[PDB]
């Protein structure tokens, strides 16, 4: 019986190590005009702007290539005892996964 420790150790997310400047494959799951909501397997989704080049190809279910910058965007602000989170990941949209 696989324990939780083994699953965590052999998890692709664990294997990825630091998430900065890592190329990932994400899937578009929501469209709001030119705002693309993409899941890449993390806790939070990332919101990208629709590219001006071949923008019609970016549709729900589309697989895209992303450069991760942060898995969760948080920051502690002056006079606060806990971090403020935007509940979103940071990534750059590169293109469509061929």
């Amino acid at each position: 019986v696989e324990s939780f420790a083994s699953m965590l150790r052999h998890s692709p997310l664990t294997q990825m190590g630091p998430a900065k400047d890592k190329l990932v494959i994400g899937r578009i799951f929501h469209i709001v005009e030119n705002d693309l909501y993409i899941d890449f397997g993390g806790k939070f989704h990332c919101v990208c702007r629709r590219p001006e080049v071949d923008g019609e190809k970016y549709q729900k279910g589309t697989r895209v290539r992303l450069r991760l910058l942060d898995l969760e965007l948080t920051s502690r602000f002056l006079g606060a005892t806990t971090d403020t989170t935007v509940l979103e990941a940071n990534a750059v949209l590169l293109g469509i996964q061929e």
Partner: protein, 133 residues
């Protein structure tokens, strides 16, 4: 109706004291179920406290042996031009292949970190994996 002092004891202790005291004619529907199958912790209110001085959280950082290899791999060959697929439960990155080969050579040879790294690089290039320093 029961006591609305949510900061004194728990709902179970308040209800039980009121029932035995005769204030409540009948037990509520959930009292017997709570009796038979209680929670691990009794839900008693507690005020979170800021830590000061030398007190520290007991949460540890999750590290593995291969992380070291990974780090130095990511420092030498850089991030793979190939893209991670986190949706696949058994995705295998270039770095993970390098780690598995490194561990295999470690268990089939000596322990010299630089020699292991160069040998593993040679092995991966022989297998047919591109690795630009």
């Amino acid at each position: 109706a029961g006591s609305r002092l949510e900061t004194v004891g728990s709902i179970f202790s308040r209800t039980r004291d009121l029932v035995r005291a005769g204030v409540l004619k009948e037990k509520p529907l959930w009292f017997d179920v709570y009796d038979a199958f209680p929670p691990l912790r009794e839900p008693v209110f507690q005020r979170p406290r800021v830590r000061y001085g030398k007190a520290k959280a007991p949460i540890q950082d999750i590290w593995y042996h291969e992380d070291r290899i990974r780090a130095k791999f990511y420092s030498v060959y850089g991030s793979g031009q190939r893209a991670f697929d986190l949706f696949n439960p058994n995705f295998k990155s270039t770095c993970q292949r390098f780690v598995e080969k490194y561990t295999e050579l470690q268990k089939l040879g000596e322990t010299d970190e630089e020699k292991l790294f160069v040998e593993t690089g040679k092995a991966l290039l022989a297998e047919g994996v591109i690795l630009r320093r």
